């Protein structure tokens, strides 16, 4: 810089001291913070966090929490407590079924779940995603493809 020069300096040295270093940003620590990645390279981080399902229609607040909480989701896949948070952009947390609410010892099929989803933002469509968005959280043979919904 011009400050790194000795006290004796011309205006030429002080000018070339302000140009010849030519400092640059180093955007390298920002690559692993999902709240500080740029929007053009956010799905690179979503790949290494193994975000299984992705939509190019969400807001960035709904894209970055799927990467930031990709650990807590993938740590507990068989639980309900991350089935609650896997449906984050579709804002819905209403009701869930369990064994003893049905009196005759469960359904034939040993209680596949029929969860309750309550969306209010999008009304057209928004059904055909939830049987496959919830597929990774669902185990391969602990549930059946029976599903319940609400608009």
């Amino acid at each position: 810089s011009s400050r790194l020069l000795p006290p004796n300096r011309s205006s030429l040295e002080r000018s070339l001291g302000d140009v010849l270093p030519a400092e640059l940003p180093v955007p390298l620590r920002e690559l692993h913070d999902p709240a500080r990645c740029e929007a053009a390279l956010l799905p690179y981080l979503a790949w290494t966090r193994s975000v299984d399902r992705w939509d190019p229609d969400w807001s960035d607040e709904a894209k970055r929490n799927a990467v930031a909480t990709s650990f807590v989701l993938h740590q507990r896949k068989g639980t309900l407590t991350a089935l609650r948070q896997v449906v984050e952009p579709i804002g819905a947390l209403s009701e869930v079924t369990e064994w003893w609410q049905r009196s005759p010892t469960g359904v034939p099929g040993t209680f596949e779940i029929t969860v309750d989803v309550s969306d209010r933002g999008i009304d057209e469509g928004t059904v055909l995603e939830l049987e496959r968005l919830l597929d990774d959280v669902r185990p391969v043979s602990r549930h059946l493809t029976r599903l319940d919904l609400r608009i």
């Binding site: 006290p7 004796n8 011309s10 030429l12």
Partner: protein, 99 residues
């Protein structure tokens, strides 16, 4: 040797480069340069000290050190006080040319 001028950027070679080579020695303090800490003069430490007859011989002994390091093509002859106005002492830096 052909270098460029400090101001105005013009490449001047023979003896105008010789004079600005000396005045980069005398006016840089020590350690002000980057990665070259043993460069420059202690004349900035001699700034605003009383002009005694031991101050004169300490400037002759320090210009000769600092020009002896980074100016081998100048043989220093003498440094003399030639005038005194309020604060402004002025020194006739005389030396023969070698190299």
């Amino acid at each position: 040797m052909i270098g460029m001028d400090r101001r105005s950027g013009l490449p001047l070679s023979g003896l105008a480069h010789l004079k600005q080579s000396v005045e980069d020695i005398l006016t840089t303090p020590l350690g002000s340069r980057r990665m070259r800490p043993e460069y420059g003069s202690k004349l900035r430490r001699m700034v605003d000290m009383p002009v005694s007859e031991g101050w004169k011989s300490a400037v002759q002994a320090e210009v000769a050190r600092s020009l002896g390091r980074w100016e081998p093509r100048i043989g220093l002859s003498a440094v003399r006080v030639v005038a005194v106005v309020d604060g402004r002492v002025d020194l006739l830096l005389s030396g023969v040319f070698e190299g």
